Amino acid sequence: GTNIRVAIVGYGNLGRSVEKLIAKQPDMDLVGIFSRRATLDTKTPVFDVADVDKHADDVDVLFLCMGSATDIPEQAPKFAQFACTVDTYDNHRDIPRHRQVMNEAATAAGNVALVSTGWDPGMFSINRVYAAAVLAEHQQHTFWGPGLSLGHSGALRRIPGVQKAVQYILPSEDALEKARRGEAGDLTGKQTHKMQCFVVADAADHERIENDIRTMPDYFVGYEVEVNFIDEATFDSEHTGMPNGGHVITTGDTGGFNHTVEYILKLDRNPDFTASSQIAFGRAAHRMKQQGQSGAFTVLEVAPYLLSPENLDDLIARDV
Amino acid sequence: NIRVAIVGYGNLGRSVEKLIAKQPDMDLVGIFSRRATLDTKTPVFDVADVDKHADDVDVLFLCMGSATDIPEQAPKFAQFACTVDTYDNHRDIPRHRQVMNEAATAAGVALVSTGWDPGMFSINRVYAAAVLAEHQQHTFWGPGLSLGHSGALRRIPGVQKAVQYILPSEDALEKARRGEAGDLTGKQTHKMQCFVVADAADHERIENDIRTMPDYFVGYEVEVNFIDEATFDSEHTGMPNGGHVITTGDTGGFNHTVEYILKLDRNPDFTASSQIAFGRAAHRMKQQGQSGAFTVLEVAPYLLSPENLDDLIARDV
Numbered sequence A: 001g002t003n004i005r006v007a008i009v010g011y012g013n014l015g016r017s018v019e020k021l022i023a024k025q026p027d028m029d030l031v032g033i034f035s036r037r038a039t040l041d042t043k044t045p046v047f048d049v050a051d052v053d054k055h056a057d058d059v060d061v062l063f064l065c066m067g068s069a070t071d072i073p074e075q076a077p078k079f080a081q082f083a084c085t086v087d088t089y090d091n092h093r094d095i096p097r098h099r100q101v102m103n104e105a106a107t108a109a110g111n112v113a114l115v116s117t118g119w120d121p122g123m124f125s126i127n128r129v130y131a132a133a134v135l136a137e138h139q140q141h142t143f144w145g146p147g148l149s150l151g152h153s154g155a156l157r158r159i160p161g162v163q164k165a166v167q168y169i170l171p172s173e174d175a176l177e178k179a180r181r182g183e184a185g186d187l188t189g190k191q192t193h194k195m196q197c198f199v200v201a202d203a204a205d206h207e208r209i210e211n212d213i214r215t216m217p218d219y220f221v222g223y224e225v226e227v228n229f230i231d232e233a234t235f236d237s238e239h240t241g242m243p244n245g246g247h248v249i250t251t252g253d254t255g256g257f258n259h260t261v262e263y264i265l266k267l268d269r270n271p272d273f274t275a276s277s278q279i280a281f282g283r284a285a286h287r288m289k290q291q292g293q294s295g296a297f298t299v300l301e302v303a304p305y306l307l308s309p310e311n312l313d314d315l316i317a318r319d320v
Numbered sequence B: 001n002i003r004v005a006i007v008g009y010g011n012l013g014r015s016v017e018k019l020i021a022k023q024p025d026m027d028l029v030g031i032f033s034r035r036a037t038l039d040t041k042t043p044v045f046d047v048a049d050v051d052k053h054a055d056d057v058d059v060l061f062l063c064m065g066s067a068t069d070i071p072e073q074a075p076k077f078a079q080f081a082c083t084v085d086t087y088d089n090h091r092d093i094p095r096h097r098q099v100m101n102e103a104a105t106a107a108g109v110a111l112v113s114t115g116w117d118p119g120m121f122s123i124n125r126v127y128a129a130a131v132l133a134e135h136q137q138h139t140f141w142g143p144g145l146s147l148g149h150s151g152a153l154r155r156i157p158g159v160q161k162a163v164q165y166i167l168p169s170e171d172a173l174e175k176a177r178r179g180e181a182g183d184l185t186g187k188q189t190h191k192m193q194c195f196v197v198a199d200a201a202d203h204e205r206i207e208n209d210i211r212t213m214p215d216y217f218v219g220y221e222v223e224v225n226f227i228d229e230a231t232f233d234s235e236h237t238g239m240p241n242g243g244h245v246i247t248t249g250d251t252g253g254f255n256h257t258v259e260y261i262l263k264l265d266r267n268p269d270f271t272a273s274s275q276i277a278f279g280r281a282a283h284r285m286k287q288q289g290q291s292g293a294f295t296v297l298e299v300a301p302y303l304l305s306p307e308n309l310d311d312l313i314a315r316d317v
Helices: A013-022 A049-058 A071-079 A095-109 A123-134 A150-157 A173-180 A203-214 A232-238 A270-292 A312-317 B011-020 B069-080 B093-104 B120-131 B147-154 B170-177 B200-211 B229-235 B267-284 B309-316
Strands: A004-009 A028-035 A046-048 A061-064 A084-086 A164-171 A193-200 A225-229 A244-253 A258-267 B002-007 B026-033 B044-046 B059-062 B082-084 B136-141 B161-168 B190-197 B221-226 B241-250 B255-264
Touching (some): A004 A270, A013 A270, A028 A049, A061 A270, A150 A193, A193 A232, A203 A225, A258 A270, A270 B120, A270 B255, A312 B093, B002 B011, B059 B069, B069 B082, B120 B241, B161 B170, B190 B200, B200 B221
Parallel strands (some): A004 A028, A028 A046, A061 A084, B002 B026, B002 B059, B026 B044, B059 B082
Antiparallel strands (some): B241 B255
């Protein structure tokens, strides 16, 4: 009968995208931003994160958007005391433990926490599991589509003499079709993708900068890397977006017959799509709690209809 | 381990039988047909003997050919086990679901309208529209053999052999991808291709019978090819299919495109695979208890997999 009352913790790119996109939901009221700064450039009310407790009964869902993950394992189980919880935690090995901690805190409070939402983890996770479950002895992969890598871009920017820079990760197109035709069992991670850098620097610094890039352990060493030096005008016009996306490809045999399942995302702006996903799962957490709560859940444990702003009957009548 | 039997032995039922033998966690009890002899080593029982396997069952795979059979036979098929059907008569699906829900409240859970459309395409329609706040969305039915249209061609007087394919307009596909396909519908987004074997004296009349056939062909762009019988037998006897679910949204001057693609060498083989997974899920609403009638929109993903949640969580998220 009434709107879901939501708030955001943190105000980096993900936070800003969520704030923007709440304006487009029929059933959500953004009641505030929780920050460690007293002032932000927005009309949305701004409070201190230490004061979250004094707003508990005013908030139904907290969107956790704390920049610099690390904050999630340390701060997010306390946030579960006061509202339902949605996060985008992407440390692929720490996720099973994060879940169990969240589970206890939420079950105590009688709230629902949804964990590791977004598109990967998130939509790609859902597609890996549906497709593998449907095809018998499948092959399945995952390509990270042509897009901006934030971590690799940060690593470039720090190199002495680098004034501006971006790194992109690109799926090998030969590897794509080999996956579609089941011809890709033996490909290692070093063969499925290439890397492409664009750098602005003084000409005297180029030789050393390219050496610095190609010899950098873990980020660049085992990979196919292209290094392009460009002027600043070119950089500012073409390389300041945040594109991303990917493919998830699955195949399988049913006795001399092949089948291919492929899921593709093509995103002009990475945090906007991550925020979209995060927002829909917040609608789901609230709804689960009103039908009778529980603990923490991954995106694998939520029925599809819970994300939608439409009634279930309305969905069944069209869409199915 | 798990309790399964199949009703029907047409293309779908055959496909389901073939694939149950690769499930690490599924046993095939037998096939409920009207005949008493089929071409398989699987035990064959008659359809009305309901009873004495009904405590040796959890869920029957409903694979009756000639759909219309399951608005009839499926509501009482319910109170013996659990149900998995692939009912694809949209518009009747909401009504079917209710009368299923009543008869399911008898220890059973009924999962209805599984397969890939309805089924996987349903799931993908709903996820992408839920996520992208003000979306445009289109479904395309892939380069594929249409069973219904192919049957309708074959019945025409003088047609000896025939097949029909439905094909997406490639203009419409990339129009959808760029978010400018809002003005279009079925008769614009798809094309039809026929291949027919018939005596040359009958070509003029047969082509007019095809092109003026209501519900199947009128209004569509239709290509009609008359070909010799050897060419027909070598090139046109498979059952390929597939499709496209394409969704776009804007987030304030930025576009996002979501696309889901199926390419299937053999339609009933992939349909049967989806039916299986939902069979396991239908059970799996087992020692979680409680039940009724549900669509694929009402089933959390992990239930499809023969693996436990923690292994999926640790591996696939």
